[PDB]
Structures are given as structure tokens and as C-alpha cells.
């Protein structure tokens, strides 16, 4: 069974578009979802082969129910507020996601255009982000970001619903959250200190030896081992965004996993603490201003509506 | 020549346009930054060569010029002329400084813009910030190829660079910016044949319409203007689309360099006020100017030294 | 069971070479077919991985009988002439086909040279066509060409012979037609009208909605659904060619499928019509001057002689 | 003042060569087209920047020149002088106009060719049309590297461009074209050692053979000429392979620009007729000229002015 | 599956080969390194995607295996067998560990090598270090195309990866390495026709010589072997040239992966000792082996878990 | 008049440095080679255009110049001036010829070097041979961006090329080479903040430190010189890392072209001996010069004769 373009090459542009369905607009959305497959290609085909245009369409809990005839993804729920001693992970409205990516921005902008064209009226926009990669895979804190993602079969294994919920095998669970960074603060740190916050070296992107790496460091609190005894894995594609004018500097978080337990556990760790840690040090510089969750169906699923 | 700023740039695929005003007090901080701008271009740009083609061109407004330097003014430098037409209005908005930042990747623009606005925290107020992108086959937001008739080589040198006529500032140029917003609902209502009648070229093949077919109210008609000699009077453009899908904003950011503004301003008069032949440029029936500023972009020597 | 390079990546250049077998060349041809796989590699290897050289070799009905004995592919027959009210699809000679593709012309030409080198004397050339990608995947009518072709495993299952004819699993059925356009006339239509002939938008390459799309449009007559409701798909890699000297502007058509009943259906609809369409409007501007049907065997069938 | 045609184009990987005659009374339609050729280059080319590298060079024959303009003639311009050698014959074939169209993709050449011959349908007759491509690693059909010793940069400017010596037409050049067909069966019969003896360089490493050993009937031998000026006489070539495998046709399309034909013509004399110490260029024993034409390729502004 | 190491690698243009021995009581420090090597691949490589193509393949010798792990041994693992032939000798040199580092640029190889040997300072002794580079058209030091007949896709899967036959170590492979030096003076003494007789393919066009005419002492002859399975017996090679013009050293570094060494070893027997119808592989008359070592390159999961 | 050698060369990522001495009686063989070197550049380079970017610059030592030619000597040409400083010593090593060979790929350098040393077997003795490689983001072995503030375009012409001041040799330049070895263990001991204090720029963003904060014993400090008139005195560098992991050798090969050596020499005086401000350039505390040689690289015409 065939999934949407979750596993993409590195792509260096993206548009993240989040919307909510006015009541009334649920037949208009059924319609767009059937066609969304074919608009990917309308825009993408003439740009082969550099384009690498891909759209991942995800649906939120509330919206699922309004929209669909029968039974529900196992894992799907509203995103869960995390009300921690110090940091708060908020929970924002979000019925639909379009995760648009390609090797150039206009390709994304063309597809977003053609989509909202068919929705004008039936939805209301919540959030829109125009993302770009730094020329050597850095995020807004200046660290290489993407290094430890899974590949090949590991990724096919850690992202796609399989036999555990087999009416939607080929689906995935996306979490999104927009973060805004306190760059004045962050850049006030020594590099040595910043490594302590992330858990890897700034310039060479090597992992800090197991005994020099703080446990409040991001890489510590997100390395998390199952019942299974094996490592538990998500797939990210965090895109910097922002505005120099509005002093806005951001990293847009997106995290695919085969179940939301995995993503959600990493987030408890980050916002609430462990045995040995108050909260994730990175959040002392990064404020979450969105949060939603979505299921991103198989592609077979959408074509048939 | 004196060595000029990177006005003659290749096709680049992304740009940031940053327009600011100088607060009271900020005079000093700005002079410091202008001396260093050259060198920030290189810091940020050098490690990504030659895939990169980062260029920053810095220009200065009329009012701002007087606050910053004493001595001679460039001959042509003035506030942008507001044009109150029968139908369409070309408006004048404030801007003391302009940064036209261009490269093949957006992040290179943004890294440079960060370093610049970083060093001007305190000293300015941002008026306009636009992130633009070329559509994949050099087309603009109306779906026509955009930049075809621009000059190159030495003809460009002749059209944009101040020379002997104001020798103090040889190597400089006069940049005019206007941010336009388009009414696409309306535009996509026309047949292609009609749209070509607005622009004056063929949509798909980008060939000029023949002299006997091309309407007098077409864009290409009203912006071809002939000199004293009857030789065509030319500018350099690098119009970039921008916008936002959520808030139905589809735009073309206009930018135009010339050796003297009398040229650029002529084209505007014809566009907004009309000739005997044409009421106004049909393109304005789909495009609304919401900014307007005039700037002088000095030779890079002039910044390197103070 | 391993197949010939029918599913090739998007390539920008191609040679189409069609020949007939002289009497007493049968030997020399079998020798060549055993080696063709290996000449692909000789020539192609040194220009990897930009190269994307692929050669697909197919065989006509009458030629098959002269070369082998025993069981024949179920579907293999001479191309069916179509004598329609208006438009006629012709049948031309063709014992062998070489569909050679790459990213550079020289690679195609070097391969074609080494093949015709080994067959100089055994065959007679009937048709030789050098094609090229126009801009951004547009054909000679100026529309985007390839867009609704199947990809990935949908293509696997629509072009490759399987269980239904198990002796020849891994094979395919290519149909070729050389078409010429009366551009004269086509450039006489407004774009609105031209879209009405094709069934998609010229510039944005989006489908016309079913409420406006004429039933005499190309996209109309070439969408066919089966008894079981699912789409019947083929794979095309139409290549423009021509000569400006002789005002010859063409699109060379090629169509692979797991059975010709599919390709042939689409042709019947194009040339002869439905209830609600006289014939495909595209033929009012396009003239078929060849027609040939070939079977492209699994690669192990050729290696093993 | 004067800007020349894109003769000094980079190495490009595809070309169309189109040669035509002017029909009776077609002179008008052609002048119209020559004024616009520059503009069609840009229409077609601009949207495919910067990969495209589309260039068209337009040249004009001797007899055609008189039909189209009088006024001054370029000093050197004459019909191609037929060379009836002891063994090998360099023939003269008809040709009033030449379009040497080059880019990185064939479709760009063909799209320009379409637009040109579109405007000339009726007024001309095509004599020769050739689609040429790069073979691997700048090799020709005989499998040797082809273009190595071409002059570059400003040395090219000096060798190809008409200057002060004929100042009316400064910026022009003299293109000679010949279409050659090869006898591959015969050529691939030679050992590589022997083939190198024909050409005068090493096949694989493309190094010159030493004075010690290079035959004087080798191609590189016969085409090295020193002037009275003691300096080497240099031309610029962009030899392009073409062919069809069906009709056993393997070719090199030859084209040679120089500031004067006396130069190109000399090399030909040596190739076809021989020296004191060599019968004819060994290359001709495998290559047959089936066309031959001479043209003048004016400065680009000269065509603008019609 | 299990995940195997990066044995089936794309075309890469550069490589570092590192062979070391483990000192007294280095066993601990090495196990530490092996657990992390996968992740240093990614540290160094990830930020240079997708041009980089950086891959590191890590192998272990027979004696070294026993020091580091007990548990099962891989079926095939043994010290490299010296072959003391009639004429030519294949030597055995020491090697406990192997790093076969490949990418598109050398500096990426070197950066990875640095980070590895950084973590082993103290605990090993370098035996062999080689910086290799492909010629631009996949040629080796003898001037022939090298890699052509290597298997691809799942036929490579089938040839190289330990499978069911020893399921403990499925995903592993057997690398044999040998460093060769050439006497190029001697080699460049042959005509090309003769050189093709040594190799068994055409120099220029890289086509196999016909079964009629290919010598049985040619390299391609002696290294095509058929099994019991009727099937051809295949390995995977990634020969890289290296050398130094100062020290008149020109080399081909050989490396050969297979699912069992019985395969690789057979080819060597035929090369060095001869068959019924060949004294030795003609290629050895121009190539001298100066190293020789055998390694097992485990499944990648086997390293992660230490 | 003059066309110069390929000194103003594009950014290239690979290089061979070859330094040799002329044996007794080899004067003949060398003159022959120098006449031909121009044309070996093109033999080897032409078939790889335009990716290849192969260039060779050939320079000649002071002692050697006298052996080879009679007539004028370049005004500036002399043996390298040894500098025995308080702490660090810049040494003089032997060198009659230099080949500074550069391309995008190393095989191209090596193929050309083969052809050169092929034609000199017997007539020279190799002193130094170095294979260099630029790291992916224009960084050197210390991990800083290297090349940033080099002059370009016309400013380079003005700073590197002999002109009217010695018009016999206009089109020439003066190359100085030094091979440096680093103590990396020591260097990677420093915090990044400290390392920036050695260099005078920011490691990660490669921005100059402001005039107030920049140490006057920093590298960038001691190598900014202004002339008598107060216009900045510039050279052109193309520092290339090299090394060997086995033999713990990690290096930067230095090369510096200028229109007169008295410029390059000045920078060195400041580096090795000090100003009042500075004991010596902090970079030498981590970098040891183990070669040193000076060469004149003629106009290219001069070799054609
Ligand atoms: C401002 C937000 C964030 C930034 C700037 C950020 C940055 C980073 C960086 C620099 C790394 C190290 C390189 C790498 O392996 O990617 C990393 C690793 C990681 N991050 Fe984040 N991150 C952010 C938010 C999150 C969130 C919300 C999650 C999960 C809910 C997450 C999950 C991970 C995981 C699983 C790893 C790798 C664990 C391993 O190394 O085995 N990150 N992040
Ligand atoms: C003669 C010149 C032809 C031209 C220029 C041409 C061009 C096109 C174009 C532009 C499209 C729409 C873009 C796309 O869907 O790929 C199209 C669609 C298609 N064409 Fe053709 N075509 C030609 C002949 C044929 C023939 C002979 C066949 C079949 C026997 C065929 C089969 C198809 C199919 C199956 C589709 C897609 C159906 C869908 O939208 O679900 N074409 N053609
Ligand atoms: C079939 C026709 C031709 C072929 C295949 C051919 C091919 C070649 C080849 C392989 C070379 C050696 C590499 C190079 O230096 O470019 C060469 C050199 C040259 N060819 Fe030709 N050529 C042909 C015709 C001509 C003609 C007709 C001329 C002049 C009328 C010409 C003029 C030259 C010149 C001047 C050189 C180089 C001299 C120097 O070494 O300094 N070629 N040609
Ligand atoms: C000494 C330097 C060596 C060089 C320079 C070299 C070079 C070549 C070349 C040029 C080819 C032909 C192209 C191809 O198919 O790759 C080839 C084929 C091959 N080489 Fe080598 N080789 C060397 C050593 C070895 C060794 C030691 C082995 C095995 C022990 C080996 C095994 C093979 C195999 C199996 C083939 C292809 C067989 C087939 O045609 O089906 N080579 N080698
Ligand atoms: C010892 C190894 C050397 C290394 C690793 C090295 C590295 C660097 C680095 C990273 C920079 C900053 C980026 C740049 O502008 O290029 C720099 C600047 C510079 N270096 Fe070096 N360098 C070395 C030796 C030398 C030597 C020996 C000289 C001169 C005799 C020299 C002359 C310069 C000059 C002139 C500048 C620029 C002045 C200005 O900033 O306006 N370097 N070097």
C-alpha cells in the first residue's frame, strides 16, 4: 500500500500551511483532497527533474470526524497542552496541513496558490510559513539539524503505520509546532556553552562524549529507548523562517512518526523533565507558539473520495 | 571607472528588499555601517562561491542624504514624485535607506540582512520588508516573462551608470522602487489574447507584438521612449514576485536603475497620466502601487572611505 | 525474473530506430540481441551517472516467427490499421525496434552506431528519428507532455507482463506511431480553443474540470476505465522531432502496456469515435505516417541465446 | 563604439546550421528579419537563462550582399573559390544567408530556427540544414579531440574581428563553412598509431606529436602557417559532428571564423593542393567536402539599423 | 533485512584507504570506535549532502577478529593466502583493521579519516594509507575504463552480501585489498592494439573483444569464471588510481568484495598461477602487488551494538 | 601588449604544488619544456572543459633565472629572505622551478604533472610535492574560512601584475611559497572565542572583528598593511590544506602572488619579527614553516619564446 511523500530528499524550500474548515465547507474539502494528488503533478511535472515538488496533506482530530464516513486512526487525537513548571507547549487550531516542499520556493508557492484557489471560502487560514535551508543544513541557532534522522528501511519502519492499524497503513502522524528564538540571549553564549545546550559540537557536528554531555541537553532528552530496548525514532524536517524587520527568528518543527506516543514522549521529556533534568535547555531560548497534530493518510486513501 | 556597487548582476533567483528610515541620533551608526557594508557582502558571500552570487546594493534617499553627508549632492537626487492621475495614483512612501540584496538562495540574502539590521538595532525603523522569488522560467506574477528587453554588456554600463555628466558621483545610479499588488481574480478573467494586448508581447513564446498590432495603451508601448537622437532610452529592472497565499496577496516588486531619474520618471508619467494616444497603462488596471521611493546608489568607493 | 529498461528516468534525448530483417540475416540478428545488453554498458558506463543511457529492444509479429519457434507472447500481432470516417491510422513495416534514450544525444548515437554496425548487411532501415525535450517537457503543440503517466509501482503493474502470460513475464507491448503536425493550422486556434482540443490548460497544465472538458478532447477519449472501475493506464515517452527546412514538426509517439488490448482501445476511441465524439480533435492537426507493434522481452530472454 | 555578434561564444553542446538562398524579390522580407534577429535571440533565449547560452550568428554571402545593400562592401568578401586539386576537390555550393545557431540544448536552437524560418517562409529556399552535437569529451567523429588549439580570450578578439584595416565594418568576421562526410569503415581500419600520423596528435591523451616524428602530410602540420609577421596565423573553429546511422552518414560540419578570408583560404590551399613537401592533407583521404560557402558576419549594431 | 554497510556505493571520485594493526591492549579503544563509526559517517557527511556521497566501510582481519570478539566467527574469514606463482607472487602484509572511505571530494574523506584516527591515537599502528582519485571518464592508471562489468542492483545484493549460508553474519562481505604499482614506462611502450590484447577490451570504446579474438592470457579472460551454478561468479571492485610524480610511483589500489572469499581467491589463483591455457594474467607483467590483506566487513547493526 | 599566466584563476578545489631544482647540464631540457608548457595545459585540460578549470602557473627562482637566460632580470627577483625572529623562524629552502597546478578535480592536476615531470625525467630533482584539497565550504585546516578578503576583478590586476614599473616583464608576478605544519592537538585545545582572537575573524560567520576588539597580534591585524599614501596593500592567496592521517601531518600550503615581493616580504617581517604592538603573529604559535622559496612567474608570451 502506497504513502504520500513523507520521505523526501533534502529539499531546501517549504511552505507550511494550516487552515480550519468553516462549517458548510466540508464538501469543498472532500473535493480538493481527491484532486490534491493531481495538482502536485500539474505544477511539479513541468519542472522535472530538479523540482522535487511534494505535498503532504494531513488532517486533525476534530476535522476527521466531520469529514469521514467511518472508523478512525488508532493514534489520532487533539494535540495535548503540556503545562510544565517553566515552559508551556501550546495547542492551536488546525484542521488541515499542507506540508509543501521542493528545491525552489516558487514551486511551493504555485501549488499553495492552486490549492487555496479551490478552498477560497470553504476554509480560514491560521498559519503560513515560508521556510528555507542555510547553505549547509543549519537551523536558526547555527547548528547542523537533520544529522541523526533515520534512512531507508529504518525510516520506512519508524514513520509508516503498518499492520498495527491496517486500514490506514501508509499513514503517518505529524506533529507541528512553530518556535520563536531569543537570538539576543542565545548569541550571548560561548560556543562551548551552546554545545552543552544541544549535545553536539557547533562546527563539526560530532556528538559530545557520553560523560561530558549534560542530561538537560536536547540530544539527551530526545534519545529515548523503548520497552523494546531499541532506540525510538522520528523523522524531522525543521525549516528556519523569519523576518529581519520584525526581529522574528524561527524554526518550524515537523515530526513524522508511526504513532504519536513517540513524538509525545519526546515532548514530555522536553517540557516537564526526567529523573535528572528540569526541562530541555533549548526551550530557555525557544518559545512554542503553535502545536497541532495530524494524520497524513496513505495516498491510495485520498484518490478515492 | 570608479568601482560601482553590484548593479549589473546576473539573473539571481531570490531577493530581500529592505527599506528603513533613520531615527534621530542614528546618523553615526549608519555612517559606520556604510563603511563596512562592502565587507559584510564578502564575509557572508565568500564561503558559498561561486554557486551563490550574493550581491547587496545600498541606496540613499534625498532627505537622508542631507542628514548624512555635507558637500555636493548627486545632480538627480530628489523625493519621489507622487503622481495623482485621472484614474491611477503612484504614491510616495518614506525611505531613507535601501538594501537590494540578491542571491541564488534565500538564506544568503537573509544572513546578510540579519547582519545589517543587527548593526542598525537602535538607529532605524523598518518601513518595508519583502522576500521575493523568480518563478521557475523567469516569469512574473501575471505569468509573462519579465526582464527580456533589459540591456546587457556595455549598453547597460551606458544606461545605468553616472559618468561625466556629474563626475563627482560617477559609478552611481538612481534606483526607483515601487511595491505593486495585483488583482489576479480579474487578470485570470481575460483570455490570453487580451492579456497580450495589455502587455504587448506573446504570453507563451515571449515574442514582441508587431508594430501594427501593439495597442498604444499596452505596457511595452508606453515604456518604449525615444531619446533626443531617437535612440531608445533604457533602464535596468529586476522585478521580483512576492506574496502570501493565506491573505490572497500576489505582488510584483518593481525596481529600476538608470543613470538619471528623468528617464524612469518619464516612463511613469506616461504610465499613470497618459499620452494623447493612451489614457493610462492597461497594466495598472490590474496592479496597485502601494510604495514609491527614490534612491541614489553610490560607487562603492564612496562608502569604502568615510 | 528481470525486465528491459521500460521504466526509464526522464531523459532529454532519444533515437528511435526501426528496421526490417533481410532474408538470411536471422542469424546475425540473434547474435546481436544476445549482446545488446552489454553494448548498453560498454558505451554508457563511462558517462555515468549523468548518462541515463537505456536501450529497449522490441520485435514485430512476423519477425518473431522467423527468429524463434515455439510459444509466442499471447498479445503479439501486426498493428491493426484503423480506417475511420475521417482519420486513418496506418500500418508500416518494422521487424525490430530500438528505443534508445539518454541525457545526451551523443550517447544515443554512439549506441545506435555500434548496433547498426553489427547489423549493416542483415537489415534494411525503415525509420530513424532523433528526438528532444522542448524547454520544460512540452511537445510540438506547446503543451506539457507526460503529466498523467503512472509512476512507481503503478507503472510496474501497468506495463509489465505477469501471471496472465507467464512464459514472457517481464515483457511489454510497445506501440509506435510517427505523427506530423499541420502547425500552419494549429497556431490558428486561440489558446481557449486549443485547451478544448487537449483537455488541459496550456500554461499551468491543470486538468479542465469535468463540467467544461469536451468529450472530443484528447484527455477525454484516452481516459478509459475497466469493468472493475479502475483506470486502464499505459506509459508514454512522446518525443518531438523535426526539421525547420522542410517545415516538418512532429511528435513521435510510443506506448508501452502489459497487453495491447489497452493501447488499441485508446486508438479505436481516437480514430473511430464514441457515441458522443466523432474522433479525437487532436487528429485534426496530427497525421500518423507510421504504425508498428512490438513485444519487448524480459532481459534474461535475450541474454540466453 | 561597435558591438559584434556572438562569435566568441563559449563551448556549447548543440547547434543548428542553416544556409539558404534568397528568392527573387525576397530582399525586402530579409532586411525586415535581419533588423529583428537580435530580438528573437532574446525572446527565445531569455526565459531559459542562464543555462541556455543561446546565440545566433547571421552571415551574408557575396552575391547576396549586392542584392541587399549597396554602399561599401567589406574588403574580403567574395564567393567561395572552388579548389580543384590533383586529388581532392573543395567545391563551391550556393548560399546567400547563414544562421549559425548554438546553445546547450538542441530545442533552443530549434525554437529560434522555427521563428526565423517562420518569418522567411516565401522569401528564401533552404539549401543546407544540419543539427550538430558534442561527442563525449569534445571529440569529433574520427574520435579525436576537436577544438584544442583554438585561440582564447583577447587573442581571439585579435584573430577573428575586423578592425582598423576595414574600419567601416569593424566588429565583423569572415565565416567559411564546409560540410564533410567521412569514410568510417576505412578510418576504423587503421591502427591508432597510423591515425595519429594522419592528425598529428595522440588520440587518447591529445598531446602534439614532436617535431622529431610528425608527418608533414598530417592535418596539424598543414594547418600551422606562419605569416610574414613571423607570428602564427590563428582561426576559430566550432566543428560539430552530425549524422544518421540509418544512411551510414558520419560527418564533421566545419566552420571557421577569421578577421580575413586570406587566412582561412590559405589553410585550404595547403590542405587540397599541397606544399613543396606534401601531396595533400591525409585527412581528405577519409573526408569528402560536399559543401563550401563564404560569408561575412557583421557587427550586431549594423543589423539593428534597417 | 539487516542494514549492511555502504558496500554498494554510487560512483565516487575520491577515496582514502586506511589499514592499521592493533597494538597491545588497544582492544578496548577499538571497540569504542567501532560502535561509533556509523555516526561519524553521518556527522561529517550529512552537512555536505547531497554532493558528498561520503561512505565508510570498516573491515576486520582474521587474527584481529579473535582479539576483539569471541562468539562465532564468519565462515570465510582467514589470513590472506600468499600465492607464490611460476612467475608472479601475490604477497601478504599485516592488517587488523580497514577503512574504505569514499566520497565525491577528497577533503570529506580526509575529514572522516582524521576523526577516526583521532579516536585511535595510541591504540593502533598505521600500515598503509592511500589517497585515490578516479580519472574523469572512469579510467584507471593504464588508461582503460575500470568498473564496467561490475554487477548492479540486486545482482550485486546476490554477489556480495553474506546471506542465509551463514545467517549469524548476514549483511557482511569479504573485502580483499592489494596495492599495485605499475611500470608505466613499459606499458606505454605497447601499441594500443597490444594493450587491448592484455586487457581484453577496446581502449577507446570500452567494448569486449569478440570470443573469436580475445587472448586466453588476457585479464578479462582469466577473471570470467563460471561456477557449479552454471551462473557467472561475480565480485564488486572499486579500483582507484593513486601515486606521486616526484617518486615516479603510479598505482592501482585494488579492492574486491564478495559474499565468500572462495570467489575472489579463485580469480587470484588463475591470475598468478595460471590455467591449463595461460601462464599468468598478462596484466601482472605491468603490475606488482606490494600489499595483500583480507577482511570481513560486517552488517552495520553488528557494530552499533558494542 | 601582454597575456599573463593563469594567476587570476577561479576558485578551484584541488592543486598540486611541485618544486624542483635544475640538475647540472639540464638547462637545455628545461628551456624546451617551458616553451611547450602552455600547450600541455591545453592538451590535458581541453577535453574536460568547462568543468575542469585546469591551470598551471610556472615560476622561476633567482639562482635558476641566471642559468637559463641572459638579458634583463625582473626588478624584484631575489632568493627568499630567511627570517630568524625572536621566537619563530621563517626558513629558506631550495627551489629553481615552481608548478602551481590547479583544477576542480585532482586527476587533472596529476595527469598534467605526469606529462611535465615525464619531459624532465633526468634534468631535475624534486624538492617538494604536495597534493592539496579545499574543504567543502572554503575552510582551511584550522577550520576558518580562507580566501575571503582577497582582491578580485580589476583590484587584483592592480595588485598582482607587473606593469610599467618594470615593463620588460609586464604580465609577470612574484609568487612566494611556504609549507606550514600545524600542531592540531594544541589548536583544538582553544575555545572558539580564543581561536578567533588568533585569527581576527569569527569562526562560524567569518565576519571581521571590529577595530576596537581585534588583538594587534592577530593574523588579520599584522597582515593588513597600508602603503605610504594610506591605500591598503593587498596580495592574492590560494592556501590549500594537505596532509596524511597516518603520519599525523596536517598542513596549510601557503602561496602568495604580488606585483613586487617587497609587499609579501613586508607581511612576513610583521608576522615573524613583530611590531611594537605585537611580539609576533599568534598564528605561528600553531604553525611552523618548513619551506620557503620565491619565484617570478613570467608573462605567458615569454615562455612561447
Ligand atoms: C526549536 C526547536 C528545535 C531545534 C532548534 C532543534 C535542533 C536540533 C539539533 C541541532 C539536533 C542535533 C542534530 C540532529 O540530530 O538533528 C536535534 C536532534 C534531535 N531533535 Fe531537535 N530541535 C528542535 C525541536 C525538537 C522537537 C520538538 C523534537 C521532538 C519532539 C526534536 C527531536 C530531536 C531528535 C529525536 C533528535 C535526535 C536524537 C538522536 O540524536 O538520536 N527536536 N535537534
Ligand atoms: C499525436 C500526438 C500526441 C500528442 C501531441 C499527445 C499529447 C498529449 C498530452 C499533452 C497529454 C496531456 C498531458 C498528459 O496527460 O500527458 C496527453 C495525454 C494522454 N495521451 Fe497523448 N498525445 C498524442 C498521442 C497519443 C496517442 C496515440 C495515445 C494513445 C494511444 C495517447 C495517450 C494519452 C493518454 C493515455 C493520456 C492521459 C490520460 C489521463 O489524463 O488520465 N496520446 N497526450
Ligand atoms: C573534416 C574536417 C576536419 C576535421 C575532423 C578536423 C579535425 C581537427 C582535429 C582533430 C584537430 C586537432 C585538434 C585541435 O587542435 O583542434 C584539428 C586542428 C586544426 N584544424 Fe582541423 N579539422 C577539419 C577540417 C579543418 C579545416 C577545413 C581547417 C581549416 C581550413 C582546419 C583547421 C585546423 C587548424 C588551424 C588546426 C590547429 C593548428 C595548431 O596546432 O597550432 N580543420 N582539426
Ligand atoms: C592490477 C590492476 C587491475 C586493473 C588496473 C584492473 C583493470 C580492469 C579493467 C580495465 C577491467 C575491464 C573493465 C571492467 O569490466 O571493469 C577489469 C575487469 C575485471 N577485473 Fe580487473 N583490474 C585489476 C586487477 C584485478 C584483480 C586483482 C581482480 C580480481 C582479483 C580483478 C577482477 C576483475 C574482474 C572480475 C573483471 C570483469 C570480468 C568480466 O568481464 O565479466 N581485477 N579490470
Ligand atoms: C600559516 C597558514 C596561514 C593560514 C591558515 C592563513 C589563514 C588565513 C585566514 C583564515 C584568513 C582570514 C580569511 C581571509 O581573508 O583569507 C587570512 C587572511 C590573510 N592572510 Fe593568511 N594565512 C596563513 C598564512 C599567511 C601568510 C604567511 C601571509 C602573508 C605573508 C598571509 C596573508 C594574509 C592576508 C594579507 C590576509 C588579509 C588582510 C586583510 O584582512 O585586509 N597569510 N589568512
TrEMBL record, chain F:
Binding site for heme b 1: 147-149, 219, 224, 237, 254
Matches recorded under SUPFAM superfamilies: Dimeric alpha+beta barrel
Molecular-function GO terms, alphabetical: heme binding; metal ion binding; peroxidase activity
Residues that coordinate or bind Mg(2+) 1: 183, 185
Residues binding Mg(2+) 2: 183, 185, 248
Domain of life: Bacteria
Keywords attached to this entry: Heme, Iron, Metal-binding, Oxidoreductase, Peroxidase
Stored NCBIfam families: Dyp_perox_fam
Protein name from the UniProt record: Dye-decolorizing peroxidase (DyP), encapsulated subgroup
Lineage summary: Bacteria, Bacillati, Actinomycetota, Actinomycetes, Kitasatosporales
